[model samples]
Target: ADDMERIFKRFDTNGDGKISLSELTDALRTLGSTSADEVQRMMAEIDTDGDGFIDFNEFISFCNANPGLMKDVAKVF
Candidate 1:
């Protein structure tokens, strides 16, 4: 939970309980993306509800489904 919170907070810069694409782009700026189309696609994949933003539940689901990504993030911290 602590680790997840750290990751979540890193992107949820406004602490609004949701991560916007702007925040995501900033967070992933070093990951070879800041492209609007890429951000849209990425958000679409993780946003199961089609709300166009990532909430904790959706992010948790994404992490569980993409263990490799989770591993990489884990290594970063």
Candidate 2:
């Protein structure tokens, strides 16, 4: 959680109290990755509020709902 928080904070450039939609690309780009399409699919699935941005609460809820998948997921990057 601490690692995630630090990483999120680093990518959250505008510091608008939450990560905006564009930060999604910024986050993956920093890791030398690209997946706007895949992330869009994921957002559709998990971003239930349809707000088009993944807040910490939404992220944590997704993590908690899919704990087993996250271990392998982190290594994907």
Q: Each model's C-alpha lDDT?
A: 0.61, 0.53
User: Which residue pairs show collisions in model 2?
Assistant: none
lDDT of 2 by residue, 1-77 (tens): 35456544554677755565445644555564555445545544556667746677765564566544333334552
Off by over 4 Å in 2: 65-77
Would you give me the overall lDDT of model 2?
A: 0.53
Q: What are the per-residue Cα lDDT tens digits for candidate 1 across 6-77?
A: 777777666688876445645565755435345445556777667746778777765677634455654464
Candidate 1's displacement at residue 32, Å, is: 7.1
Clashes counted in candidate 1 amount to 0
In order of appearance, the predictions have TM-scores of 0.62, 0.54
